[PDB]
Design a protein around this ligand. Structure first.
Ligand code: ACO
Ligand code: ACO
Ligand code: NAD
Ligand code: NAD
Ligand code: N8E
Lengths: 706, 390, 390, 238
């Protein structure tokens, strides 16, 4: 044959047409690893050199076309200089660019999944045929990076700015129907007639019927948008995403900046822009370990998967209590294909739940994001009830009853007598011990903790609080059930405050100290947002609520009095005692986001010193207390590995992604140089006191990772 | 003297501009509203035989439901107008009604008819704007989708020319105040045709004013509203934007020849017509290009125009248009002396002839000679007309 | 000799007429279909700068969803046509596209533009006719509601002139037969612009013919169909009625002056334009009044016309019109020599310019001098145009 | 149109139009004469074979429908036995008219069919413009799936849609009778089985009647109220 590699076999066909096939021999899927990209080069060079070729068809010998790229091999290539990195992806793009420059028609017969680099290969060809049962997209954003193989160059010019920005920024998969309408694909057919379509199409390009040259042009030249049409398009996109992405902007807000700049450029120059910005999101030391993300991700994605083939099926679920949290758990479980029952005691409750679940569904339909037929399915999935008559086939049950140890125990023990004995029970409590609630039940092995965060549909993280008598199967099912609901679960052992919350308040402890030191909270969060945090300390406190934060303070103070039991009134007590209950009340550190000098009056009694501080120190008063507590959560055995200890912060509290995590941030400074930094702030309390184990591994030149 | 085929506007009559959110027209179809208007207007002019109307050119945008299937004929059939006449609906989004005036004008000039009945209608209450919209994804391949959102364009055009929140709100106040004034003083009595409607209690009664007008509109009351198209740093508020209004406007047009024969004194005479295009992103800038083209064809300088009627889409767009037209310092002296779409509402398929009609009343009332009526159009367009009082 | 402001049709290009019930255009928007046509037609004529296009007049009826919000501009923006140009959508039901040609013609004549891009489109597949219809009860107070049902009118006008079921079916056969021939002989190769589509298998391929045509249509197969609008004693069947077709038609128009300068040979020249009205009940009779008015304006007798294009709405209406026009005995010699809407489909907003464009190709091919294109319009209307080959 | 669907003996339909067609160009007074003249023709020809009967017969009905009307029990909560075809319709109709209904069945596969069909109808109207997305929400919430009788506590009227089987229907009917109030009304949707037969299984036949719907439930207007031999008036009235 023309080329017989281990991943790509370029086989010849009729009328000089050649079929470049992707079939990673040995593996189950096709992906652009070092080997694949290498053979592609040899493949293209072969076809290119062969002057007898009259067309090229791209296919796959697997169930999927080409899944994302297995990035573990590309990691060592991102820690080099931005020059030796940009020119690095530049060379990689030379392959696809050349394939796109083949003086012959090229079609991509997409049989199945074509995500990430898989789609980028397709965008390179002239035509693209797709099986109605396939999916395509660019989920790069979930990794903190945007398309690096011409994705930000070809898609925008192929389907249009707005459509590309949406496809890229969101990283959502797209069905044949949608991929065809936006013109990402040129023809959708049944799986059986895929090969015939690609073949019949190529022949129509060769004969001259179809101008394959004219169809390729659009992604070689500038965008068709006006200078004015650009400003509108880009600014709206940027803004829209800027407020929904916050200070820590991975691929969303940057992807648009790259398209806006490479707008008036052709392929070659556009690729350079893509490469440059791509490096800014992947580079090294300057506090930008977007490296640790994958070091944590490639360990959770594997650890979770192992849990996923163990967990029981969650074909039937149910939640105790409607309204706020209940309506969310029901919504999420319904929108992900899991029939859930909304159990409650009064009809007024079910009304609240059904209402909120309906307000969210209509919210998407009243804009175009959700199909009316889909809203129907979701609503049918949610099934109201004031009894336990239908709890006969429920696999996993979640509790959302009012915050009360006694009540929760009665309710939990109650449901345990109306479901199968092999059924899993879980509480959504946040300030009550899971090991305490389990005592009421007669089957603690099936009882665990499933902690969601308000709003249930907004926040990603879901803590799986394992009790002392919780079985592995129990945790496995809960973890899996969380992932199925499009979440990111993390196993955490039972303790006052768990992992996220227990670490989120010490962080706020540093804030409370700043305000008491005459530091303007407005300047504070502006600095914390400049750091990478989604929301600022003061602004976040308003969202959570001053009345809530005040209650949580006592919960953590009682938990670990030795270091989290302050007491000298702070901004928290000030606003609480001043009726400024936060965002829900309409007045907190801000007004509802507005500013007003009236808040200064309330905070005056808290100012104990007009201490001066740089924005650099402000970051320490906050981060140090948060990092150290994480070290304690790892030492006390609240989280098993450092990997889990940081992602719990990345998805929960919203720890800056490109900075890795609390523990990785420590490494970014140096464990030995971190304790030295902490000592200077030791005069602030036990919150800034390094642990014995940290001091021990400080002298040994030991770091949390390697 | 005039030439035989010179276009002459004989009369102008509009309906009371009522709110859409449960206004006075909440129980009246657009077809009937138009049919009634055309019928009543033809009455005041008993010397123009309805049978002579060669064609009825009606403007309308969202042509579906009540407004679908050539509403021009649908509304014409319920009029004293014979079945022997013709009718067509002209859509150009905002400038629909005006384009109608132009079509008939050119027809008359070319000897394809002598008497016409132009105008437009838009019942945004029964047929809202967002109703039945299917955004073509392919449009994003040649132009920004955001340009489809009139509001955002107002924001962009505004940023460019630099118009402060106060500058816009102040404009809205001037519009409401002047509208109320003209109303109270009866400067609208001639153009407004009394029409049946229902008050907030479902009771039947005739309205002869514009519900849309809000005299209490103060800089203080407008500075309380929040940005409508851009919460995080915006100036265009519902107060400085045109109102969603249900309403129709009519206008009898014919040649000076057939006019001189009927011995009826003209209301005005069309001297030049012009339409131009701009980028969708800043469509609000449509008036300047369209105006400049009209002035050249009319062989006139912007200074030769005594009165100006610039349909107020947004204070953010009207002001810039007036600045570049070099007449901002002449506003209170000759620009929308009876208020604008901000206080009188803006019925898409209607505003075209309405602003022009009101333009004539201003000239006639203030001894003006040359007048100008222009307006910006969606998706980047503009249109202008230069009338003349003789 | 030439008169500077004389209207000249430079070129004409239409899309392959495809069925609506799962045809070749079931996956293509009306906007794009129109944009592509306009773009491709402009290519064939590289001597007419798209920037000179003063305005794009597009005809469309059911203006909602894909076809709503001034499709003229929406389709013009995705064309090489600059954003500096304008665009308006003219609706007159059936004769929408033709009225568009008239609007531009008049504009050119009056000196309000030099180059225009007229035409029309109607994707009855994505935007069906009965879609979004709200019959105004008030209409029954001035006219029979039944008149709204084109079919019933065909039945009524048919009975009056006495056209037998055989006479109608025979006409349909003539249409299909003559359409297939013109297609096979390549008498459509110049006007039909190849266009991408999808076959019954979802496959992508370019069509350059009309799916609508059915060569197997025989008197035997037609006499098998049942009355479509009157089961108990009807003649108008789906076979003698025009087809529901998705399609677009374009036409570049300009003044003879700006034309002579570009040294491009004219395809035809507009001599007279006319629109007339009739009773809704027998709307199909619209052509005769409109035609007579056109002939008088063109100073020509019906006999002076070499070829005629009568939009075949219903065999029951086409025949009567041809009889009163006194040319029924001249049919096979000069009437719809390439078939009609029965075999080529009748895209509401498109048929206007389509039949006119085809008319020109017939003349050019058969050395004709004077041509006539006319069509009946819903709710009682008619429109006619008399071209000339020079 | 009326001539064809009224046929040879045309009462008021075909005549009313001939009366208006003639008095068309006339004013009130002259039109009144036309109306009167034609009215006499109908009374002495077409309707001579009693106008009295049709009238008094309607009289009996408006009173009967009224007697039933306010002795009848208010149906605030309803439920249907069996989803799928007939169940999804009875649930749809009860939901679209402001009546919370329960879709009871034995297997999860059934509830799916019901919820699906009810959804297909609701989306059908929204996907063209006749129904509000907010309205489809209410209707969907009105329908509450279930595989038990735990929530049948406040149901006032229960409808059965189980497969055509005398034995099965009897078992199901008698079953639900032990999970609802005693004053609740039960009704079968059967079409080929005697209501008087089914009632024998129940222990409260007075509350059992027959409520016959026609496929499709949302299309056909008529609903037969098959009264059994032991059916109380209150049962039928409700
Ligand atoms: C180019 C051209 O020719 S036209 C361009 C096209 N533009 C348009 O079609 C108009 C665009 N405008 C719109 O779409 C709408 O008016 C919007 C989106 C701006 C606002 O609509 P909404 O978001 O629904 O807000 P809404 O209209 O309900 O706000 C009304 C409130 O403003 C207040 N308000 C409005 N105008 C005034 C005023 N002049 N003075 C004081 N208060 C006012 C009302 O009192 C009311 O307050 P309340 O609710 O407490 O009673
Ligand atoms: N208005 C109108 O113009 C007409 O009333 C129409 C076009 C809407 C009528 O069409 P519809 O009512 O939508 O469809 P209709 O019920 O007539 O059925 C069409 C059938 O007639 C057939 N048909 C139509 N015209 C002809 C003809 N000239 N010869 C043979 N068969 C024909 C079609 O092939 C189709 O049959 P199929 O479904 O087996 O393919
Ligand atoms: N503040 C927040 O938004 C937030 C954040 C994180 C976690 N949570 C968790 O959410 C839970 C609180 O839920 P909520 O916010 O909906 O409270 P809520 O007061 O808003 O609503 C209480 C609901 O529980 C129902 N309920 C009470 N007792 C019941 C019983 N015995 N059986 C069945 N239903 C019963 C009530 O009818 C009502 O619908 C707690 O576990 C809390 O830790 C809340
Ligand atoms: C009419 O309509 C009725 C038939 O309805 P159909 O067309 O939906 O029949 P069908 O066969 O289409 O569906 C039967 C439905 O009844 C349900 N069902 C059967 N036995 C049941 C039981 N014991 N308890 C609860 N649900 C049970 C099934 O699960 C199914 O959903 C008859 O009464 C006929 O006369
Ligand atoms: C022509 C006569 C034919 C006679 C047929 C005899 C049929 C008799 O069968 C008896 C009915 O069997 C009932 C089936 O039991 C179903 C139990 O479903 C329980 C569902 O529980 C769900 C808990 O969540």
């Amino acid at each position: 044959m023309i080329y017989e590699g281990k991943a790509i076999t370029v086989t010849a066909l009729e009328s000089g047409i050649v079929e470049l096939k992707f079939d990673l021999k040995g593996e189950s899927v096709n992906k652009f690893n070092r080997l694949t990209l290498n053979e592609l080069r040899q493949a293209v060079d072969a076809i290119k050199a062969d002057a007898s070729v009259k067309g090229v068809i791209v296919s796959s010998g697997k169930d999927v076309f080409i899944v994302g790229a297995d990035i573990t091999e590309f990691v060592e290539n991102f820690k080099l200089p931005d020059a030796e990195l940009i020119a690095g992806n530049l060379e990689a793009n030379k392959i696809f660019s050349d394939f796109e420059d083949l003086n012959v028609p090229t079609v991509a017969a997409i049989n199945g999944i074509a995500l990430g680099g898989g789609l980028e290969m397709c965008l390179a060809a002239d035509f693209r045929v797709m099986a109605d049962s396939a999916k395509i997209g660019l989920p790069e954003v979930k990794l903190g990076i945007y398309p690096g193989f011409g994705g930000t160059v070809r898609l925008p010019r192929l389907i249009g700015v707005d459509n590309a920005v949406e496809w890229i920024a969101s990283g959502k998969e797209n069905r044949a129907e949608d991929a065809l309408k936006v013109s990402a694909v040129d023809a959708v057919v049944t799986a059986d007639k895929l090969g015939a379509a690609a073949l019949d199409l190529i022949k129509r390009a060769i004969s001259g019927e179809l101008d394959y040259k004219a169809k390729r042009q659009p992604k070689l030249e500038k965008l068709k948008l006006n200078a004015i049409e650009q400003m509108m398009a880009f600014e709206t996109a940027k803004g829209f995403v800027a407020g929904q992405a916050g200070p820590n902007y991975p691929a969303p807000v940057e992807a648009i900046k790259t398209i806006q700049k490479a707008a008036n450029f052709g392929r070659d120059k556009a690729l350079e822009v893509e490469a440059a910005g791509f490096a800014k999101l992947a580079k090294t030391s300057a506090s930008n370990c977007l490296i640790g993300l994958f070091l944590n991700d490639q360990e959770l994605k594997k650890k979770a998967k192992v849990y996923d083939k163990i967990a029981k099926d969650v074909k039937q679920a149910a939640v105790l209590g409607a309204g706020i949290m209940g309506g969310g758990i029901a919504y999420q479980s319904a929108s992900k294909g899991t029939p859930i029952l909304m159990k409650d005691i009064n009809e007024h409750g079910i009304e609240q739940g059904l209402a909120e679940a309906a307000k969210l569904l209509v919210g998407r339909v009243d804009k175009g994001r959700m199909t009316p037929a889909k809203m129907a399915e979701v609503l049918n999935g949610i099934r109201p009830t004031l009894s336990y008559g239908d709890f006969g086939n429920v696999d996993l049950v979640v509790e959302a009853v009012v915050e009360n140890p006694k009540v929760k125990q009665a309710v939990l023990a109650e449901v345990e007598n109306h479901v199968r004995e092999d059924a899993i029970l879980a509480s959504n409590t946040s300030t009550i011990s899971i090991s305490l609630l389990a005592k009421a039940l007669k089957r603690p092995e099936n009882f665990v903790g499933m902690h969601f965060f308000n709003p249930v549909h907004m926040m990603p993280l879901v803590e799986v609080i394992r009790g002392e008598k919780s079985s592995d199967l129990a945790v496995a099912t809960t973890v899996a059930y969380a992932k199925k609901m499009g979440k990111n679960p993390i196993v955490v052992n039972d303790c006052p405050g768990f992992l996220v919350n227990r670490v989120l308040f010490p962080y706020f402890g540093g804030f409370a100290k700043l305000v008491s030191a005459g530091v303007d909270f407005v300047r504070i969060d502006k600095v914390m947002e400049k750091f990478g945090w989604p929301m600022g300390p003061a602004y976040l406190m308003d969202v959570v609520g001053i009345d809530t934060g005040h209650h949580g303070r006592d919960v953590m103070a009682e938990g670990f009095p030795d270091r989290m039991k302050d007491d000298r009134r702070s901004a928290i007590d000030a606003l609480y005692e001043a009726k400024r209950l936060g965002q829900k009340n309409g007045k907190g550190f801000y007004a509802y986001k507005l500013v007003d000098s009236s808040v200064l009056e309330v905070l005056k009694p808290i100012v104990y010193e007009q201490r001066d501080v740089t924005d650099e120190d402000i970051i320490n008063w906050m981060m140090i207390p948060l990092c150290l507590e994480t070290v304690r959560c790892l030492e006390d055995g609240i989280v098993e590995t450092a990997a889990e200890a940081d992602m719990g912060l990345v998805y929960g509290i919203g720890f800056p992604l490109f900075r890795g995590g609390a523990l990785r941030y420590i490494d970014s400074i140096g464990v030995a140089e971190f304790v030295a930094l902490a000592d200077q702030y030791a005069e602030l309390g036990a919150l800034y006191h390094p642990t014995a184990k940290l001091r021990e591994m400080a002298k040994n030149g030991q770091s949390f990772f390697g | 003297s005039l030439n035989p085929r010179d276009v002459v506007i004989v009369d102008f009559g509009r309906t009371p501009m009522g709110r859409s959110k449960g206004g006075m027209h909440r129980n009246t179809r657009a077809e009937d509203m138009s049919a009634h208007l055309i019928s009543k207007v033809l009455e005041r002019n008993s010397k123009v035989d309805p049978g002579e109307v060669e064609d009825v050119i009606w403007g309308c945008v969202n042509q579906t439901l009540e407004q679908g299937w050539n509403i021009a004929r649908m509304a014409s059939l319920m009029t004293q107008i014979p079945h022997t006449s013709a009718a067509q609906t002209v859509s150009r989004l905002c400038g629909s009604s005006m384009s109608a005036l132009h079509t008939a004008a050119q027809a008359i000039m070319t000897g394809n008819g002598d008497v016409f009945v132009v105008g437009g209608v838009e019942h945004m209450g029964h047929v809202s704007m967002m109703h039945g919209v299917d955004p073509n994804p392919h449009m994003s391949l040649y132009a920004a989708k955001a340009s489809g959102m009139m509001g955002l364009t107002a924001e962009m055009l505004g940023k460019m020319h630099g118009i402060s929140r106060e500058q816009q709100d102040a404009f809205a106040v001037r519009s409401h105040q002047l509208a109320h004034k003209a109303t109270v003083e009866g400067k609208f009595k001639d153009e407004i045709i009394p029409m049946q409607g229902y008050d907030e209690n479902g009771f039947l009664k005739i309205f002869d004013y514009d519900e849309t007008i809000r005299p209490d509109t103060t800089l203080e009351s407008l500075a309380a509203l929040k940005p409508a198209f851009n919460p995080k740093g915006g100036t265009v508020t519902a107060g400085t934007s045109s109102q969603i209004t249900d309403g129709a406007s009519c206008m009898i047009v014919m040649s000076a020849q057939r006019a001189k024969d009927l011995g009826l004194e003209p209301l005005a005479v069309i001297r030049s017509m012009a339409v131009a295009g701009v980028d969708p992103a800043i469509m609000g800038y449509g008036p300047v290009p369209a105006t400049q083209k009209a002035l050249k064809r009319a062989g006139l300088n912007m200074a030769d125009i005594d009165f100006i009627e610039l349909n107020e889409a947004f204070a953010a767009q009207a002001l810039p248009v007036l600045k570049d037209l070099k007449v901002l310092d002449k506003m209170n002296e000759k620009v929308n002396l009876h208020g604008g779409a901000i206080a009188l509402g803006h019925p898409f398929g209607c505003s075209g002839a309405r602003i022009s009609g009101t333009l004539l009343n201003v000239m006639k009332q203030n001894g003006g000679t040359f007048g100008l009526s222009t307006m910006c159009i969606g998706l980047g367009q503009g249109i202008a007309t230069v009338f003349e009082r003789v």
